[PDB]
């Protein structure tokens, strides 16, 4: 269990979206076996979960043509600087804060040499599936690095200096909203009623 | 950042409904970069909330002809009594919180002179966008005012006292679930493959 | 009041969703009333349920035919052991925590006539409409009984022992997202644009 299921959630007066019959976070067996029996804030995020996922088979309409399919946002993540720490001898290995990924560096790499060893700390969060997707490196600037995330949610990074390095985020392209995989079924011409004009509208199914 | 980033949330077992990858609150760049490395509040939040939105472009459908749009909530605050303060002299300066907002008042005020120093402090809420949408004076009653929210959530707000003045609250008009701009497209008169009577569905485009 | 009222919630930079206006989580008037002024946790929820529960009478289509009413879990509350408590002597009245289900049990009971004592936990639950559904008796084993909860969450709960007994949880039936009363109006057979194949369509509309 986590903070969340011991952290009181105040319910809607006369809310009853739960199966008909309660308020979006009242109590469960989930927070009562450890103890809490208040309406809380994971029993409530896990009710609108709940009410926001279709299921598979569930067809979504548009007129656009667009997959409601989720989009990860995509970055450059900027470096400039040199790996700085007067108190330390030339060369020394240090360990460096990169957007939260530990970067082992040494004392006087340029950003070029630190960028290489920011493209190990990526490795290894993707290889853990810890918040990164995929990366590659830029095509024509060594001090910088191209990022996609495994969620769909939107990131601003604040830019900042550690151990001399000045490290910053470049959006490149914004993510979208959506989840799930949907299949286009194709489209259906329709003159809607008493009109002469017709409209496409085009069909996508979840199919996982 | 202020707690939500910080605060920990139990992940659904078995649960990849983001991206297909994984479950709803799973860590992100966003707290790795300020020094949190596991599955969070404000994560979780920002997933359901990106399985809730339709793009725009999406049609809904339902058989009441009634937009999908969604409906702030209107009340009426109704003041009464005289500003007292026996601590000080009459006349003198006050603060007097009216539903939190800060109201510059003066002892010995009467509750419409109070009622007018109100409306200067729901103008300032409303240039600072700050809950208030907006708010107009009651027709024929002077110790009360009607005003709108910015949000569509429901608000029971407690009747109280505070420096001799008693404020509360009065529902006028009901929030409605919702959100974007919606627009009509037409009806679509059909009749359901084995049945004898035809069914007439509205269609809403999202166009904002 | 609650702690999500008073707990930070960082909005999404440029959101607007909240009535085209606003961010979720933007502070509302029910938080200003408590003296609190920052986005947070109560409004995000509350915002996204907003988004995500559509109204009575909207129409959902699927190709399965399957209710997009949600589903409660089911599971089986197995018992093992015998009611011990060496401190006191044989037939001492205790309380037990079952899932945090206060039972009345006396030292020396075997866990089938502790089981007893547990139906009446489960009762005073259920009739109190605390996170319990339903429950009824394992179809063959007496040490274990059927239990469906009020919501549809998904619970895991790990196995513990108190009082000489082992409880343990398993899970029968799985949850199912889902919310309100839908009725299927009947099926639409149409031969999507350019298709020589027809496709069936179903749809439901939310009746409550």
Known sequence: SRLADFLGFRPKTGDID?????????????QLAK????????????????????????????????????VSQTDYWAFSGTVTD???????????????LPVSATTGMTAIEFVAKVRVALQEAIASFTAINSYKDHPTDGSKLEVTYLDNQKHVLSTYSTYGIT????????????????????AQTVTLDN????????????TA
Chains 1, 2, 3 share one sequence.
């Open 35 to 70: 103890g809490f029996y208040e309406p809380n804030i994971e029993s409530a995020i896990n009710d609108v979960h709940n009410f926001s996922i279709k299921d598979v088979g569930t067809i979504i309409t548009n007129k656009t043509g667009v997959s409601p399919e989720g």
């Open 86 to 100: 007067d108190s330390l001898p030339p060369g020394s290995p240090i360990t460096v804060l990169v957007f939260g």
């Open 18 to 30: 739960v199966m008909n019959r309660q308020s979006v976070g009242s109590v469960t067996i989930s």
């Open 167 to 186: 490290i910053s985020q470049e959006i490149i392209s914004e993510s979208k909203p959506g989840y799930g995989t949907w299949n286009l079924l194709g």
């Open 195 to 206: 009109q002469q004009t017709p409209t496409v509208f085009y069909h996508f199914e979840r």
